[PDB]
Design an enzyme around this catalytic site. Structure first.
Site, PDB file in Angstrom:
ATOM      1  CG  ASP A   1       7.140  -5.957   6.964  1.00  0.00           C
ATOM      2  OD1 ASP A   1       8.481  -5.760   7.698  1.00  0.00           O
ATOM      3  OD2 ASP A   1       7.488  -6.636   5.670  1.00  0.00           O
TER       4      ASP A   1
ATOM      5  N   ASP B   1      18.825  -4.071   8.052  1.00  0.00           N
ATOM      6  CA  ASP B   1      17.608  -4.392   7.807  1.00  0.00           C
ATOM      7  C   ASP B   1      16.832  -5.122   8.776  1.00  0.00           C
TER       8      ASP B   1
ATOM      9  CG  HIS C   1       9.509 -10.046   3.387  1.00  0.00           C
ATOM     10  ND1 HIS C   1       8.979  -8.942   3.922  1.00  0.00           N
ATOM     11  CD2 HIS C   1       8.436 -10.844   2.996  1.00  0.00           C
ATOM     12  CE1 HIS C   1       7.637  -9.046   3.978  1.00  0.00           C
ATOM     13  NE2 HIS C   1       7.221 -10.124   3.526  1.00  0.00           N
TER      14      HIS C   1
ATOM     15  CG  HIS D   1      12.285  -7.315  -1.626  1.00  0.00           C
ATOM     16  ND1 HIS D   1      12.781  -8.649  -1.104  1.00  0.00           N
ATOM     17  CD2 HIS D   1      11.706  -6.943  -0.881  1.00  0.00           C
ATOM     18  CE1 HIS D   1      12.221  -8.747   0.287  1.00  0.00           C
ATOM     19  NE2 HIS D   1      11.573  -7.497   0.357  1.00  0.00           N
TER      20      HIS D   1
ATOM     21  N   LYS E   1       0.904  -1.262  -0.025  1.00  0.00           N
ATOM     22  CA  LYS E   1       0.147  -0.007  -0.162  1.00  0.00           C
ATOM     23  C   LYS E   1       0.734   1.514  -0.178  1.00  0.00           C
TER      24      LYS E   1
ATOM     25  CE1 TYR F   1      34.519  -6.670   4.175  1.00  0.00           C
ATOM     26  CE2 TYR F   1      35.233  -8.568   2.990  1.00  0.00           C
ATOM     27  CZ  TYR F   1      35.507  -7.629   3.676  1.00  0.00           C
ATOM     28  OH  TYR F   1      36.757  -7.014   3.899  1.00  0.00           O
TER      29      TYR F   1
HETATM   30  C1  LIG Z   1       7.886  -7.846   0.562  1.00  0.00           C
HETATM   31  N1  LIG Z   1       6.613  -8.978   0.252  1.00  0.00           N
HETATM   32  N2  LIG Z   1       5.277  -8.783   0.629  1.00  0.00           N
HETATM   33  N3  LIG Z   1       4.691  -9.684   0.336  1.00  0.00           N
HETATM   34  C2  LIG Z   1       5.438 -10.435  -0.728  1.00  0.00           C
HETATM   35  C3  LIG Z   1       5.004 -11.625  -1.538  1.00  0.00           C
HETATM   36  C4  LIG Z   1       4.953 -11.416  -2.908  1.00  0.00           C
HETATM   37  C5  LIG Z   1       4.696 -12.727  -3.577  1.00  0.00           C
HETATM   38  C6  LIG Z   1       4.318 -14.040  -3.056  1.00  0.00           C
HETATM   39  C7  LIG Z   1       4.598 -13.948  -1.825  1.00  0.00           C
HETATM   40  C8  LIG Z   1       4.817 -12.823  -0.790  1.00  0.00           C
HETATM   41  N4  LIG Z   1       4.162 -15.338  -1.371  1.00  0.00           N
HETATM   42  C9  LIG Z   1       3.828 -16.025  -2.492  1.00  0.00           C
HETATM   43  N5  LIG Z   1       3.282 -17.390  -2.802  1.00  0.00           N
HETATM   44  C10 LIG Z   1       3.092 -17.872  -3.882  1.00  0.00           C
HETATM   45  C11 LIG Z   1       2.801 -19.317  -3.984  1.00  0.00           C
HETATM   46  C12 LIG Z   1       3.561 -20.453  -5.301  1.00  0.00           C
HETATM   47  C13 LIG Z   1       4.449 -21.363  -4.645  1.00  0.00           C
HETATM   48  C14 LIG Z   1       5.154 -22.194  -5.448  1.00  0.00           C
HETATM   49  C15 LIG Z   1       4.770 -21.823  -7.090  1.00  0.00           C
HETATM   50  C16 LIG Z   1       4.220 -20.625  -7.489  1.00  0.00           C
HETATM   51  C17 LIG Z   1       3.391 -19.708  -6.462  1.00  0.00           C
HETATM   52  N6  LIG Z   1       3.127 -17.307  -5.191  1.00  0.00           N
HETATM   53  C18 LIG Z   1       3.626 -15.678  -5.116  1.00  0.00           C
HETATM   54  N7  LIG Z   1       3.705 -15.133  -6.165  1.00  0.00           N
HETATM   55  C19 LIG Z   1       3.866 -15.721  -7.589  1.00  0.00           C
HETATM   56  C20 LIG Z   1       5.405 -15.995  -8.139  1.00  0.00           C
HETATM   57  C21 LIG Z   1       5.641 -16.569  -9.319  1.00  0.00           C
HETATM   58  C22 LIG Z   1       4.683 -15.647 -10.396  1.00  0.00           C
HETATM   59  N8  LIG Z   1       5.116 -16.451 -11.656  1.00  0.00           N
HETATM   60  C23 LIG Z   1       3.225 -15.283 -10.195  1.00  0.00           C
HETATM   61  C24 LIG Z   1       3.090 -14.599  -8.779  1.00  0.00           C
HETATM   62  C25 LIG Z   1       3.809 -15.275  -3.698  1.00  0.00           C
HETATM   63  N9  LIG Z   1       6.770  -9.878  -0.659  1.00  0.00           N
HETATM   64 ZN    ZN Z   2       8.924  -6.613   4.328  1.00  0.00          ZN
END
Ligand code: A1ACV
Ligand code: ZN
Ligand code: A1ACV
Ligand code: ZN
Lengths: 352, 365, 365, 352
Positions: free
Chosen positions: A255, A165, A169, A132, A22, A213
């Site tokens: 967070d 940090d 994450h 990131h 956000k 490092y």
């Molecule tokens: C700082 N911060 N705040 N929040 C996040 C954050 C951002 C994103 C994800 C996330 C946390 N946890 C997630 N879990 C999954 C589940 C999964 C498991 C195995 C294989 C596929 C998906 N998929 C996510 N996104 C996909 C990644 C691949 C892309 N092609 C489409 C979107 C995310 N970072």
């Molecule tokens: Zn974070």
């Protein structure tokens, strides 16, 4: 000695319906300024929108040439490169995607320049905290990585910089961008284990001349302040004395507190106020950026007093009309004999 | 003590031998009878020692030419076949007749098994039958039987579960977000895809056994969510990593069926496995029994058994206590309430007594 | 068939009950004797049915007031205690006396156990005792008993094994190099550290179960080397990853003892585990028995048992068939030949019969 | 069109007693020249020892400044950087460590320059084949990575280059040095699974703008020619037609044949002669380098005919006095339904 950089309209770029990140986090943060006295004792500034020429110092020119094009339209043509830069699915595309990040990194490098001329000794720019992003791709809602540009700016005037940090994450881009270099000390306190970054383990430290490092602290669920502070303070207390450094960067992820969406930790009000305060005692120049944070209410209420602890003036618990500003710190899988083990491992690694 | 001077030599084969020899030397080549039993004029050479060692009523009876009235000849034959060989092929016709006498003759195992039979197919000093009969009050003449997928929930969904009326769906923009449709929850502190969302009310909590990782690896991890405190704690891991496996609860135990497993060190192959997680002992094991049908299966719990459907019109019954399958004949998904099979490719309640069916997509659970 | 109409109800508890009730209702509260046995004037109320169901000689005897001479009263008491309760605390004094009669009275289990006793502690139609006696010919009045670590082998060594006189040592500049000191080998196609180098002659080969990886992870992989063709083939994996675990072979089976295991998702903790790899069935399992002593243990094989030493002067016997420990009392390493404990911190043969010891570093194996 | 580059005294730098890598591999390779007619039909050259200025195009200047110092002495002073560059334990330090690698990369870039002026269309320099080294550290007995320098040399005249490695060990440095770039296509046929590199899995392909610009073939033990050739030829037959390229580089590791120390594969005499021959049909310019190889006898006998198959003249099986020159191709865990699966996976990945 506070010189606070606030973007005029940072909270004008939407990120998506029901989307985790956000951009209004930073607006509601400082938007208790209608009855905020500290501003009279603070020097408020405005950031200069960073140009592509400054940003291409680390990012590949193709990346920046790409970034200045996306919009709610102009996606089909770049559909062959949208998947070549990881944008679109995890880190989406919204209005002014090349404006919010540009102004945030402009403010970050403005604070870097201000510290570079010995003007002031502490500078906060909560619009940073994008650690990131990588050289050629974006990850974790981070398109442009402000921390890396700020560190590159400081790399000439200062030869030794810290990055600390406390975001949940792991900071990968802020670590990969200087992995092989022996000039920057990166430190990240993250949850490892089938979490988002998938990196920053206990063993992935250093590369070549940048060997050792880096510092990674893999925590677990339900950490508390009474142990988090005691496990957190000695890491800096050791790294500062072992690095003989010049300046520090403080990525403060809000967070990492209780009740946060996607936030596993559970920290108290005054428990969080030990990174923005104990870092000041070291007397070195310091940047201060803010990273990811969700559950707007708490991520803003807890953020209100971060500046206060960064300037050393107590703000009365009864806050203005613009309910309370107090929280609570479930179970704690962070066994003391595990956190102690990792602390000893880090202490032995730093001595190398 | 020292094995070279003296030690205690206990054998588990002794019970097997003192069972098999007993079975072989009575039902065939009758010898050492020493007792004569009258069953409506039928003469039986029932050996004394074997009896009374399981039925105390026969001990009392034979503590220093018998009548034993009010017993059916065929039911007594079945009882003798039990007491002598342990194996009886019971039938629904002779259930009640074999029930009342068995509770009389102190046969705990048979008492329990006929109580289970009566509770399944639908007075004495047992609670199980009484509670089962009391539970059959909804049809003596308040909650939706099964939750489909009227709301919208535009957020992307990859898993859902029920806990009695509270539809807890994993989903959102990021899968970790947990939405509650009771009548929001603590964020899931793991990155999982195709995770099994079990809901065991006996130790009320929600379990997230198995899944896939962002690095495209199979997760052999179980994490539980305490209902009353919104605490996503962590429990003991699985034994074999799986993803997209069916899940079903039974009196505390959680059964994980099929799914995909690690094949050739880089890929996923459909698996036919049985896994059990004891939500009271907090231990996992893998049952030697292997399902006939592999792939993407959906399971439902009916009484004391579990129906499984994998691929086609063949449903596979499963009795966890007996470790045996019925393999009835008829991508589908079974939902057992009050059974009902639903076709996924939508281009109908079931009666398991006679294998007769009546005629009347994302996550049916 | 369909569980709602008819099915076969087989129970494993039936054997347990027909053993426990039999045991409880003879040795105490003697009833339904029907037979009187004379043992040098001692009157026994031995029940008929129980006997003959294990000893066929008593079947023949009681197929339509007895003598049963040439039997010791105490040995017959032991025999009755066996036949009735299955548990006998045998002693070396009453071994031969309990042996010859038991082979007479068709007691296969007792026959085998006394044959094992005689083979261990050192005529009838059994090969085991005859072969064991024949093998005891080296002392009726050619190869080194144990290979130390006279050669030099300047190459760095991380593992070694014996196959009857052929010292196969993993080592070199790169550990994959295999050196042979018989009286060179195919390169090891894996990167392992602290891998267990078992040598099972029954399926003659060399196994490399367990180890550590270059990425600092525990290897749950078993790869075997065929002796006759220099073929480093691959076999089924382990169940739990270990490194630096003791290894010992017994009649084909390979036992993996202790070592280090994965603790806290990043480190290694000393483990107390029992693993069995069936080099004939090619299957792995983990025994429920857990060693009292954990850490870095060294095991040796003596007769039908295994001595284990972990930390200190306490050695732990292990009988795989009986699943029990002796826990005698006295970093060490046990080498069993013709036993002998060697101290690692060198800043002595053993006699297990009376736990009495006599007095006379990299890889002792 | 043969222009063969042979270093005069490459086999004069010892590597250690009982050490796996042998710098004499390349001497005994061509040292059947006392009765080798093909040399009359071949143009033999000598390589120019590459300078540090040419090598520092990719390697960090500190690395090259380090490299020109080590010797049988001068180790205690650099003991704090010897562990910061991975040298000493795995990749040891021997006499002339900055001479053998320097001359090898000089020959490699000499062949690159010769192809760069359209002089010839095929050039072999068996002294290359060091693909393990990295930007800031050394790995796998590879201090200076010749392939990366040659590819950088070709990157200006040609915009699309191939690197094909049939060495058992994964080519990491030759892949990490151009991971994010979209200009070079790397392809490596390696054994994955607790082997030396620990990388080059089926999933680790691409980075940012270099996404999908890599190909990894994880094989297993006991592969045979009858399947290796059938699984190997279509990969190039597909990648060439899908890449529209300019030039190719052929890293030929002779440790990938039968009886090799540390060599798990088992390939026949003519089975190996399908990378140095089928690559010629594509008619594009080609570098040819030689990588690791042990068991001097076989690694040399099998290498004898690689040049012959690269020039298209049959050499009679009865070789000179300077026994035979024939080998055999145990078990094969490379299940056909597994190799076929990986082939289909690669075919589907390339089409992306
Ligand atoms: C700082 N911060 N705040 N929040 C996040 C954050 C951002 C994103 C994800 C996330 C946390 N946890 C997630 N879990 C999954 C589940 C999964 C498991 C195995 C294989 C596929 C998906 N998929 C996510 N996104 C996909 C990644 C691949 C892309 N092609 C489409 C979107 C995310 N970072
Ligand atoms: Zn974070
Ligand atoms: C083209 N090519 N040909 N041969 C090789 C090659 C080169 C090296 C090794 C190797 C193969 N296999 C190996 N296995 C091990 C066993 C081990 C497992 C887990 C943790 C530690 C060690 N250690 C090796 N070296 C160490 C690396 C760390 C350093 N401090 C000392 C030396 C090597 N590359
Ligand atoms: Zn190689």
């Amino acid at each position: 000695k506070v010189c606070y950089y606030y973007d005029g309209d940072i909270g004008n770029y939407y990120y998506g319906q029901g989307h985790p990140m956000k951009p209004h986090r930073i607006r509601m943060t400082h938007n208790l300024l209608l009855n905020y006295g500290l501003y009279r004792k603070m020097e408020i500034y405005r950031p200069h929108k960073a140009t592509a020429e400054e940003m291409t110092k680390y990012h590949s020119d193709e990346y920046i040439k790409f970034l200045r094009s996306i919009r709610p339209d102009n996606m089909s043509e770049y559909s062959k490169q949208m998947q070549r830069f990881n944008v679109g699915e995890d880190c989406p595309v919204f209005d002014g995607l090349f404006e919010f990040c540009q102004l945030s990194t402009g403010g970050s490098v403005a604070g870097a320049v201000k510290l570079n001329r010995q003007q002031t000794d502490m500078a906060v720019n909560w619009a940073g905290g994008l650690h990131h992003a990588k050289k050629s791709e974006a990850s974790g809602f981070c398109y442009v990585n402000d921390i890396v540009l700020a560190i590159l700016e400081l790399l000439k005037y200062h030869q030794r910089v810290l990055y600390i940090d406390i975001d949940i994450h792991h900071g990968d881009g802020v670590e990969e961008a200087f992995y092989t270099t022996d000039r920057v000390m990166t430190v990240s306190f993250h949850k490892y284990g089938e979490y988002f970054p998938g990196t920053g383990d206990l063993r992935d430290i250093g590369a070549g001349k940048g060997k050792y490092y880096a510092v990674n602290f893999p925590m677990r669920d339900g950490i508390d302040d009474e142990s988090y502070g005691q496990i957190f303070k000695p890491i800096i207390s050791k790294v500062m004395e072992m690095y003989q450094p010049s300046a520090v960067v403080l990525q403060c992820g809000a967070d990492s507190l209780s009740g946060d969406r996607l936030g596993c930790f559970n920290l108290t009000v005054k428990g969080h106020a030990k990174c923005v305060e104990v870092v000041k005692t070291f007397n070195l120049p310091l940047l201060m950026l803010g990273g990811g944070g969700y559950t707007i209410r708490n991520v803003a209420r807890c953020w209100t007093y971060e500046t206060a602890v960064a300037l050393d003036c107590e703000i009365p618990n009864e806050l203005p009309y613009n309910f309370k500003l107090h929280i609570s710190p479930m179970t704690n899988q962070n066994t003391p004999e595990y956190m102690e083990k990792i602390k000893q491992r880090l202490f032995e690694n730093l001595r190398m | 003590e020292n094995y070279f001077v003296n030690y205690t030599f206990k054998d588990r084969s002794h019970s097997g031998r003192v069972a098999q020899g007993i079975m072989k030397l009575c039902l065939e080549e009758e010898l050492f009878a020493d007792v004569t039993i009258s069953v409506e004029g039928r003469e039986f050479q029932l050996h004394r020692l074997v009896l009374s060692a399981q039925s105390c009523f026969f001990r009392s009876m034979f503590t220093s030419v018998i009548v034993l009235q009010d017993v059916s000849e065929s039911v007594f034959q079945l009882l003798v076949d039990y007491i002598y060989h342990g194996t009886v092929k019971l039938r629904a016709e002779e259930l009640q007749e074999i029930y009342e006498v068995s509770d009389m003759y102190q046969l705990t195992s048979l008492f329990e098994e006929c109580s289970r039979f009566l509770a399944r197919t639908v007075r004495h000093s047992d609670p199980e039958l009484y509670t089962a009969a009391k539970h059959c009050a909804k049809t003596h003449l308040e909650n939706v039987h099964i939750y489909l997928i009227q709301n919208s929930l535009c957020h992307q969904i990859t898993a859902a579960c029920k806990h009695g009326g509270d539809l807890y769906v994993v989903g959102g923009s990021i899968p970790r977000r947990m939405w509650k449709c009771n009548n929001w929850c603590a964020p899931l502190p793991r990155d999982r895809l195709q995770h099994t969302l079990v809901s065991v009310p006996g130790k009320d909590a929600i379990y997230s056994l198995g899944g896939k990782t962002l690095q495209d690896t199979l997760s052999n991890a179980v994490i539980y969510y305490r209902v009353g405190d919104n605490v996503w704690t962590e429990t003991t891991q699985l034994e074999v990593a799986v993803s997209g496996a069916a899940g079903a609860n039974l009196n505390g135990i959680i059964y994980l069926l099929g799914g995909e497993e690690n094949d050739l060190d880089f890929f996923t192959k459909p698996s036919r496995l049985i896994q059990c997680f004891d939500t009271e002992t907090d231990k996992c094991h893998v049952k030697p029994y292997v399902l006939p049908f592999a792939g993407r299966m959906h399971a439902a719990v009916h009484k004391d058994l579990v129906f499984i459907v994998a691929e086609g019109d063949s449903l596979v019954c499963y009795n966890p206590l007996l470790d045996s399958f019925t393999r009835l004949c008829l991508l589908w998904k079974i939902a057992s309430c009050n059974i009902y099979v639903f076709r996924d490719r939508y281009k109908y309640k079931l009666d398991p007594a006679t294998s007769a069916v009546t005629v009347t997509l994302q996550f049916v659970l």
